[PDB]
Design an enzyme around this catalytic site. Structure first.
Site, mmCIF file in Angstrom:
data_model
loop_
_atom_site.group_PDB
_atom_site.id
_atom_site.type_symbol
_atom_site.label_atom_id
_atom_site.label_comp_id
_atom_site.label_asym_id
_atom_site.label_seq_id
_atom_site.Cartn_x
_atom_site.Cartn_y
_atom_site.Cartn_z
ATOM 1 N N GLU A 70 24.674 13.791 11.911
ATOM 2 C CA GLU A 70 25.621 13.312 10.879
ATOM 3 C C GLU A 70 27.033 13.727 11.184
ATOM 4 O O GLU A 70 27.138 14.674 11.955
ATOM 5 C CB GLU A 70 25.302 13.829 9.446
ATOM 6 C CG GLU A 70 25.015 15.320 9.387
ATOM 7 C CD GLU A 70 25.189 15.963 8.046
ATOM 8 O OE1 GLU A 70 26.067 15.482 7.319
ATOM 9 O OE2 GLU A 70 24.476 16.919 7.706
ATOM 10 N N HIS A 99 26.479 11.753 -1.065
ATOM 11 C CA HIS A 99 25.743 12.923 -0.597
ATOM 12 C C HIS A 99 24.285 12.676 -0.259
ATOM 13 O O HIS A 99 23.297 13.317 -0.718
ATOM 14 C CB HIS A 99 25.785 14.096 -1.619
ATOM 15 C CG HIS A 99 27.121 14.744 -1.804
ATOM 16 N ND1 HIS A 99 27.664 15.665 -0.913
ATOM 17 C CD2 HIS A 99 28.008 14.635 -2.810
ATOM 18 C CE1 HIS A 99 28.846 16.087 -1.346
ATOM 19 N NE2 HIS A 99 29.061 15.455 -2.495
#
EC number: 3.1.27.-
Length: 107
Positions: A70, A99
């Protein structure tokens, strides 16, 4: 480069994140203190990115030998935001703006 399109294209083309990224371990080492929201104090212009993303809620597509990593997107300063780009070892690109709650494929 820290925009969804910009990092997405860079990754697919150059197969590495741009020079402004550092992993969380490297940022901790450099003086990053998460609860102090100080990344841009100890590492101006830098974003945390490149760490492995486990995929346990199992929301992104799996495949034998595929790894997910990520990188934070849109970060300038203060506490990390809610935006992330997710990229597999085979270059499927997804993004999240809440998130890791939901993901949309972008490449």
């Amino acid at each position: 480069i820290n925009t969804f399109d910009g990092v997405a294209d860079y990754l697919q083309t150059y197969h590495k994140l741009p020079d402004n990224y550092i992993t969380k371990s490297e940022a901790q080492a450099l003086g990053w203190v998460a609860s102090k929201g100080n990344l841009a104090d100890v590492a101006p212009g830098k974003s945390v990115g490149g760490d492995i993303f486990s995929n346990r809620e199992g929301k992104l597509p799996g495949k034998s030998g595929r790894t997910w990593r990520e990188a934070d997107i849109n970060y300038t300063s203060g506490f990390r935001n809610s935006d992330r780009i997710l990229y597999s070892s085979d270059w499927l690109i997804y993004k999240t703006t809440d998130h890791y709650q939901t993901f949309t494929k972008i490449r």
